[model samples]
Target: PRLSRLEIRNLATITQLELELGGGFCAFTGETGAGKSIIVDALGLLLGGRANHDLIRSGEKELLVTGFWDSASRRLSSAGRGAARLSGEVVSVRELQEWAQGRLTIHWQHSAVSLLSPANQRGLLDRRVTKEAQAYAAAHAAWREAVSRLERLLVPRGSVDALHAELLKVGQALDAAREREAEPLVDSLLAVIRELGMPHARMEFALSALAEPAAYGLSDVLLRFSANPGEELGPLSDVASGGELSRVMLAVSTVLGADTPSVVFDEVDAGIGGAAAIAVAEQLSRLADTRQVLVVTHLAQIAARAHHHYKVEKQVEDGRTVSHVRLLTGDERLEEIARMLSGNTSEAALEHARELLA
Candidate 1:
């Protein structure tokens, strides 16, 4: 069980890092590259993130990465169905080695674009891994059978009908799903509609009752309308606005009410500002109900949401640039948020920072 404690020593710029996490909500804030993703990458590897030779760092022959899991997850283990939980209405992976009955589901930021490709887009619309992965599996077993027959030096009678039937079965699953689609992501998006999820009346009321047009359009009409037309838009505009994104994010957070020990957010609040940031701040406070969320962001809107903030500063040390991270709270966090507000920690910036941190 590698979910209870995580320690990384001498991995890239993160030298001798140790973290003890509880299951709820935790957030990590620092300058870009502060080795935040590096830590995420390490966790990914232990969780069967992906297999790639390039992951091994230069000059480091091998990387020593360790994670200690809590026995709570192991207690839920089974033989066939596997174990993963869905707390919120989110479709994220619950456990690493238990996505599909001992198969693992690991997401890589780099491969996220693959989901947009014509092949992958079709797969998403079809709700299945492309037939290519299936074809490879079939040919793999075929080649193994041929190798066995070669040991006897006999051209085993080929079952042309059997191979055709296998091909037909696989193709038919694709075609059937295409006909009666089983898209989890799309299905989840559509599922939100059943709950009468969006805040249409609130927007009309906010528009009517609230005087400011500036506050109204940006968060209300612009952002919500920006979501793909006729595509599923549910509680996103209801539970959240641009300001409410973090709150909804907190609501949607896998960490909150999760049995998993941790959560990582990369750019969870990229295009939010003002009231949305405050909403995010309030939600982050509530997110501590279950686990922790480590966020990688440059937005003060989101960074201000951290209960504990760390700043990463880099300087040339011994002819090489080295990063140093310092935990910030009280005056320190104020200064960082001030720097985020305006490059200088002026009185106005400090006042705004106080409001943010408050």
Candidate 2:
């Protein structure tokens, strides 16, 4: 999930790290050279990101990270199996991930089994469902009841096995087609972002149009964009330069996260400054009303908008790097923002940082 327990092992400067993240707004701050990016790396791994063997400690077997989710309510036993302390929650994604992690650790030298596991596959897909969507997406109670009734009816008498087999055969192809159809659409959306400007200009146009017409005619909209350029000059080909692509990608991801519980943006604020940075922060704040966001940023404008802050730091001992993280508040967070403002820790930087925080 966007926020949860993020664990890291044998990563860059971090030999090991375990963080039990709280929900809603939280922040991390620290001086430059702190292993913040390593934390981001761990989060990425938990998100089904590719594992980098190079990141493993020089002499260690491998690196690992585990993520957890509290509720999916897909099954009653999944909820009831836990003690009363965990009664309200209906799922334990952590247990599943730990199981996967154990399996991976067992075959430490091989990656195929861990990489191909269905649970891992489901973890990635399940993340796409935002926190807001998780609470009521299926009306858990009704969904569980309906599925339970179906299961009892079909398997109780063992009379629906033939029907089930026929359904499975037909449904497999149907599900395959449904999934394939979405791939091109998401691909095209990513392409459009690559070519056009971010958040505003291009994405705003697409969001406005797609919000209404997506169910009606998705292909028609794609064809229209492909055939002729709109006033905003939507992309038909790859972008011409690097900066435009970055902004477009940021915009696409940011806007697409409207329904998500939270969004984490790693280095999305890089290589930009002044007004552009402020614009990015403003939009993120607007989105934060109903969702949370964790951004890895160095810009003062972006950092200033954070409702919470964390400082990540690294200490070298005996020629080895050790990473640590902590939350920042009030003056502490303000000082960090100041350092970001001037790219240096100075009195003037502190003053401006104070103004920004104010």
Candidate 3:
């Protein structure tokens, strides 16, 4: 399940804001100072971002953010107002985000750098090879046991033959274990790339045992990719275009699966437009089939694809700066997307927005 509701009180310029988020694709759009990003900030705080006392409204004493998950069994009512706990005793951001079902794979402008990185790709593949990992773990443990026995054996010359034989057997077993674990991950990554709109994409990995195991049987892993048919696979960053890399990153997360129930993409649709934007939108929608996807985007094509659309605007209420977010539908959604298309919702822009949605 995903986060079903969010309540914000006296956080930044928002006095009281309540929103119901869908379990599928939801997009947020607004003017420059419309406080659209405040939604991201509020979620960050709920997920354990640094809380600044100054963030409270000018007259308010404290600020609070409450999130309700789809799987929540109960809620709380205090001071004749509804409130609920969004997290447990966990005091860390990672744990809080996990508890609130908020697994954010941020894709900012520079995010492409990290996403296209080699280590990140290897890590992504490594997560899917669970069965092989377990097998390697067991085999490595057995090898370690053999080494311990060899070390304990006294009278070196008298036991030299037996020791050498045992050592050789254990060494071979370790080599086999490393290969056994790496094979499935390469296979899974290849399938994932194919699903990310690259029917003929290929992935290759070069794995070598690290001299010393770092915690979990360390290995030096290199990942390479080829997106075109008959092309030699090279480093993913060097071979794939920015657009291709972004889609591949999305595919990796969507196919490998996310532990949390929701993902938030902060401007993941950067440096791409036209058919590529539509393709990115389609991939995000595909991801939402199983998890909630909240995206902050400016592209009309991308925003039009959201199952739920929200518009954030800055308003002056009682001479106080305030930000409000309204769920948009029908013509309201059209106007917001139209504004994104052009500076204003002109007749042509509205018609274009409708076509984009259609």
Candidate 4:
């Protein structure tokens, strides 16, 4: 349930960089433009991310990104002409992506923003209660099938009236079952996030107009989100800031991981500072207790909480800028955090970094 090791060879500025990661909220930290995201991108490629010719490091023949899990290893070695292999056995990129479905799930920066929306929440609920979702689907399919049959029938046939009445009854049954079946699941899903915010998230089923028999599709039900009670609930994204957005996503993942062993979050720390960063760090810690969570972050609050801290730096070597990563600990760890705090390893910054670590 963790990425035990990652190897990036000839990727962008990275030349033979290997990372040994431990579980529980490993954080990658470095200055802006220092190739921090290179680690995220490298791991992403192994997880079936984009493989463009541009990703092949200049002057190098090809790019090799390999990942080792508990059971086996996945190696993606490629040039503009690329290929994949699973534990020395060749496989297609599509096969690689499909195999990695439950192995590792990544939460990109924008996914956090979308997590607040009702659409994704509805999806999350539908996925969790498979039987209920299938039940709804069956009724919905049956209802829609009646529509097509009635439409094709000759207008002189009075069967349309009887069909309409039955479809109306089906619609009513769906609405009643919708509230009873969907709302309870959401009620328990929100129970874990009360401290984060509990607006008593409700299922708002906005069924489309069905004045005409031809009208068909799902009843538009969504799990509405809000932070506090007595507050009007709007679309989840617009009402929350970056910090709330990140925390909410973590809480949601806790409830519905779908057996995804590890999650990689690329710069989910957007627009967060002050105590909000501390709160997010705490939530990240709680999440890491069971899942292997990796975050690419600029904020030291999160970096300070890492079980394993990686310092990514760009150094000039052999007349070229090379991006290399090293696992930081002891003085090196303190120095890295101190540098980010004040853009240098100042005496007070070191002391503050030590306090942050302590």
Candidate number of the best lDDT: 4
In what order do the candidates fall by TM-score, top score first? 4, 3, 2, 1
Q: Give the alpha carbon lDDT tens digit for every residue of 190-248 in model 2.
A: 55443332422332112122221111111112211221144445442333433343344
Flag the better candidate by TM-score, 3 or 4. Answer: 4
Per-residue alpha-carbon lDDT of candidate 1 for residues 275-317, written as tens digits (9 for 90 to 100): 5445554555555454455555565655666655656666665
Q: List TM-scores for all candidates, in order.
A: 0.49, 0.53, 0.67, 0.70
Model 4 TM-score relative to the real fold:
0.70
Model 4 ranges with Cα > 4 A deviation:
31-36, 70-79, 109-123, 127-248, 255-258, 345-347
The runs of at least 3 residues in candidate 3 whose Cα sits more than 4 Å from the true structure, single-residue gaps closed, are 32-36, 51-61, 70-123, 127-131, 144-208, 222-248
Q: Cα lDDT for residue 183, model 4?
A: 59
The Cα local distance difference test for each model comes to: 0.43, 0.47, 0.63, 0.64
| Model 4 residue 62 lDDT score | 79
How high is the lDDT of residue 49 in model 4? 64
Predicted candidate 3 versus true structure: per-residue lDDT over 1-358, tens digit per residue: 5778877777768888888776588887774233433545666555444444555667766667766763221111233232224343324444554454344444322233245455555555455555555555665565566567768773544344554454445544444554666567667666656654567888766666677653244565667778889888887666446556656666666766644566666545655677767777887888888878777778898889889887877789889968888889678888888888896889999899989888
Over 4 Å off, model 2: 23-36, 71-257, 343-347
